[PDB]
RNA sequence: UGAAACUCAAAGGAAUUGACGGGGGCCCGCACAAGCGGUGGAGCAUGUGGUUUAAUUCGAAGCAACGCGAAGAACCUUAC
RNA sequence: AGCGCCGGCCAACUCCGUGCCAGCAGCCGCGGUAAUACGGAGGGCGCGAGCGUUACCCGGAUUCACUGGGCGUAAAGGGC
């Protein structure tokens with residue numbers, strides 16, 4: 001989740017199980033559809049909702065212009 | 067006949083009754099993340115009814131939802147009317163070669179009959195086991211007699227049968243124990 | 252292609268007064284209609300229902316990176 | 321029967337059996353659905369008609385019919401029911417009125433709108 | 443192949459064994475009589491019609 | 503003595519005209535019989551079924567479809 | 583200026599879409615590629631600031647029959 005440009009916010013239990021909540025930019029949120037299957041053996045889930053705006057680092061900034 | 071081949075025959079005979087249990091436990095609306103619960107269902111493929119395990123691919127990605135991956139989009143409408151079939155009370159989306167089924171949190175009216183269903187399939191498995199064991203002792207009654215075998219021998223053959231029988235019982239108890247905690251979870 | 256373009260603009264018109272969250276606006280430069288939305292599932296059912304209730308001679312990309320400056 | 325007989329016993333009056341028990345003396349009754357279903361009818365009709373089992377505020381839980389094309393009803397949906405049977409759907413003694421509570425009208429009705437809860441077009 | 447085959451039958455082909463009689467009022471490739479050029483159906487249509495000279499119903 | 507819930511759009515009465523009868527009566531047709539030569543069995547001719555096949559074109563289905571539409575398929579005919 | 587209807591009862595007809603599907607239905611019943619019966623349109627009938635629906639009472643029900651019904655075979659003569 002962090003190598004997906006993630007900034008964690010905390011974790012909590014649920015079905016025991018446990019829930020984890022973070023902030024991830026949409027661009028790095030495509031493979032994550034089926035990636036939770038590759039990891040959790042098909043036992044995880046998610047929801048994903050938009051939040052806000054920010055300023056991408058100049059590593060991806062100055063390279064998106066092409 | 068003989069002993070080792072009677073045990074292998076027994077352990078084999080009891081396995082089939084055990085796997086039959088697992089079949090009966092998946093095909094229930096469990097925690098409802100199960101894929102095989104929807105894998106067997108009466109449909110309508112070209113007039114004739116047939117099991118959809120020769121029609122589509124059930125796969126359970128996330129637990130809360132489930133997909134019934136199909137390969138015939140005129141059968142998905144035959145499946146969709148066959149999912150909307152009296153039972154599960156579920157509202158599936160369809161098409162785009164897709165067929166999604168989200169699962170509501172099991173209510174205490176259905177959670178009530180789920181456990182009750184599990185333990186029922188549980189006991190019947192054990193009775194399948196125990197009825198096989200008695201078949202095995204009768205296989206032993208003749209086999210000891212037929213072969214002019216010792217007494218203290220034919221005693222341990224009984225205990226060795228019990229050892230075997232308490233094998234398939236503990237697993238059967240453990241199967242329906244887990245499947246419950248997924249319903250209570 | 253090509254003469255059934257006016258059913259597209261009339262298809263999503265039945266969904267504008269029925270679902271007022273997503274938008275349909277053509278691109279100035281590059282020039283093309285972009286069907287906005289809220290998510291993949293939101294813009295999968297619009298793509299599905301149109302292809303199977305409204306025929307719509309169409310096939311799309313499509314990413315969704317929709318940046319702003 | 322003799323005039324005398326009629327004095328003794330008397331002409332037995334005929335009783336009107338109500339045709340809608342769950343309604344319980346009301347014109348309408350609110351309820352909540354337990355199943356969303358499609359049930360095939362008897363001979364010689366073949367289809368899959370939209371039927372929703374509803375547990376009413378009268379304590380009752382009967383089988384209700386969803387008229388028109390396209391419904392949004394699901395489990396936990398709140399709905400209002402009226403009278404009305406179906407000659408070829410046994411057990412179904414009641415109709416669900418479109419356009420009330422969680423039950424929404426049919427889209428793009430033109431004829432006979434007020435029966436299907438469809439506002440006037442623009 | 444109905445209108446293209448009766449027109450094929452008007453054009454003299456490449457070799458003479460391919461010569462087949464085609465009816466001259468309906469277009470049959472079988473039961474076509476060279477004495478009438480029609481076919482056994484258009485024979486009976488016109489026999490009763492009398493327009494076949496002399497051709498009358500036989501009964502002996 | 504004798505309910506109901508539920509469920510059906512009929513359950514019935516007689517009579518009429520048909521058809522049917524392992525019902526009757528009086529008849530006829532190579533229908534049986536009485537006769538005579540055949541088929542099935544053999545080898546081939548010809549048509550279908552099936553499979554085969556790039557195609558083995560389509561139709562005809564108990565009688566009343568099977569030397570039938572074809573009273574002339576090497577090519578043509580010929581639709582595959 | 584809206585609502586209901588426009589298969590028979592029962593007043594008011596065609597077109598297209600659909601193909602025992604989607605749906606209508608108060609009864610008998612409609613939809614299996616020419617649907618006056620389904621959905622829309624054009625057209626028509628009926629009412630009007632109302633129109634349709636559900637629930638109930640009575641009517642038609644002479645179908646609890648005093649007015650004004652029956653009981654051989656239809657439901658019904660009591661075993662005597």
Ligand SMILES: [Mg+2]
Nearest residue numbers: 217218219221
């Ligand atoms: Mg000892």
Ligand SMILES: [Mg+2]
Nearest residue numbers: 439440441442
């Ligand atoms: Mg307006």
Ligand SMILES: [Mg+2]
Nearest residue numbers: 443444445469
């Ligand atoms: Mg022609």
Ligand SMILES: [Mg+2]
Nearest residue numbers: 445446449450
């Ligand atoms: Mg030509």
Ligand SMILES: [Mg+2]
Nearest residue numbers: 472473482573
């Ligand atoms: Mg001839």
Ligand SMILES: [Mg+2]
Nearest residue numbers: 516517518519
């Ligand atoms: Mg008679």
Ligand SMILES: [Mg+2]
Nearest residue numbers: 517518519520
């Ligand atoms: Mg008679």
Ligand SMILES: [Mg+2]
Nearest residue numbers: 523525526527
């Ligand atoms: Mg006779």
Ligand SMILES: [Mg+2]
Nearest residue numbers: 540541542548
């Ligand atoms: Mg022969």
Ligand SMILES: [Mg+2]
Nearest residue numbers: 550559560561
């Ligand atoms: Mg053939």
Ligand SMILES: [Mg+2]
Nearest residue numbers: 560561562563
């Ligand atoms: Mg045919």
Ligand SMILES: [Mg+2]
Nearest residue numbers: 531564565566
């Ligand atoms: Mg004959």
Ligand SMILES: [Mg+2]
Nearest residue numbers: 586587628629
């Ligand atoms: Mg009216």
Ligand SMILES: [Mg+2]
Nearest residue numbers: 588592593594
């Ligand atoms: Mg009329």
Ligand SMILES: [Mg+2]
Nearest residue numbers: 588592593594
């Ligand atoms: Mg009229």
Ligand SMILES: [Mg+2]
Nearest residue numbers: 595596597618
């Ligand atoms: Mg006319």
